Amino acid sequence: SLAVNLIAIDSQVLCGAVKWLILEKQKPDGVFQEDAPVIHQEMIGGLRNNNEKDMALTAFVLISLQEAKDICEEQVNSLPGSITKAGDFLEANYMNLQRSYTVAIAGYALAQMGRLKGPLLNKFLTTAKDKNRWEDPGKQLYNVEATSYALLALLQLKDFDFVPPVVRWLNEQRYYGGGYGSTQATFMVFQA
Numbered sequence: 617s618l619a620v621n622l623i624a625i626d627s628q629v630l631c632g633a634v635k636w637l638i639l640e641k642q643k644p645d646g647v648f649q650e651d652a653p654v655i656h657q658e659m660i661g662g663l664r665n666n667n668e669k670d671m672a673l674t675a676f677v678l679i680s681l682q683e684a685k686d687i688c689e690e691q692v693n694s695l696p697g698s699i700t701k702a703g704d705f706l707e708a709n710y711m712n713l714q715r716s717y718t719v720a721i722a723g724y725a726l727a728q729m730g731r732l733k734g735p736l737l738n739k740f741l742t743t744a745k746d747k748n749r750w751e752d753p754g755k756q757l758y759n760v761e762a763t764s765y766a767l768l769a770l771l772q773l774k775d776f777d778f779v780p781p782v783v784r785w786l787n788e789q790r791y792y793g794g795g796y797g798s799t800q801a802t803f804m805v806f807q808a
Contacts, residue, residue: 617630617680617683617684617687620687630688631684631688634681634684634692634695635692635694638695638698639694642698642701642702645701645705646674646701646704646705647670647674647702648674648678648702649673650669656797659799659800660799661758661800661801661804662717662721662758662761662762662800663676665717665754665758667718668713668714668715671709671713671718671722672717672718672721672722674702674705675706675718675721675722675724676725677702678702678703678706678725679725681695681698681699681702682699682725682729685699702725706722706725707736710722710723710726710736713739716744716745716750716751716752716759716762717750717752717761717762719739720740720750720762720763720765720769721762721765723736723740723765723766724766724769727768727769727770727772728772732769737773744766747778747781748781748782748785749763750763750765750766751763757795760801760804760805761800761801761804763785763786763808764786764804764805764808765804766782767779767786767808768807768808786805786808791805793805793806
């Protein structure tokens with residue numbers, strides 16, 4: 617969906633996968649379940665942490681479905697209904713999060729719809745430590761990724777008053793991507 621302006625992306629292939637995730641790997645409540653975990657468990661990024669995988673995965677798949685919205689609205693009619701469902705589950709279980717990574721990846725999935733207000737909006741902001749990074753006690757690559765999703769969320773909600781401090785923290789890290797298991801860390805840090 618991001619490389620649609622770079623090369624010739626087929627609508628049949630792109631929408632074909634979108635239609636599958638909705639009618640197959642989606643619970644009635646809107647939760648997406650993993651049935652066949654990828655072999656390379658280092659390319660998934662912060663999703664490797666077993667903690668709250670019912671929120672991280674659902675938030676990850678949700679983002680991909682919204683970025684392929686305009687491309688797959690006429691070819692997929694079950695998209696609008698699925699988008700709302702996935703947002704309902706994350707919204708209800710958003711106040712029950714501890715990991716800064718989960719809060720960030722879920723915040724951007726709700727910010728795209730504009731469903732990140734009230735207490736939910738306050739939590740996402742207060743989660744950031746020193747108000748410039750969404751970090752968790754562990755690897756740094758997961759923190760860089762979490763901050764990336766958080767940045768995109770702020771940009772989607774148009775909060776340019778809390779962006780400068782965040783972006784500054786990223787550039788000072790001097791992370792030029794690349795490195796074992798840096799698929800998510802690189803793709804997201806440069807997308808933000």
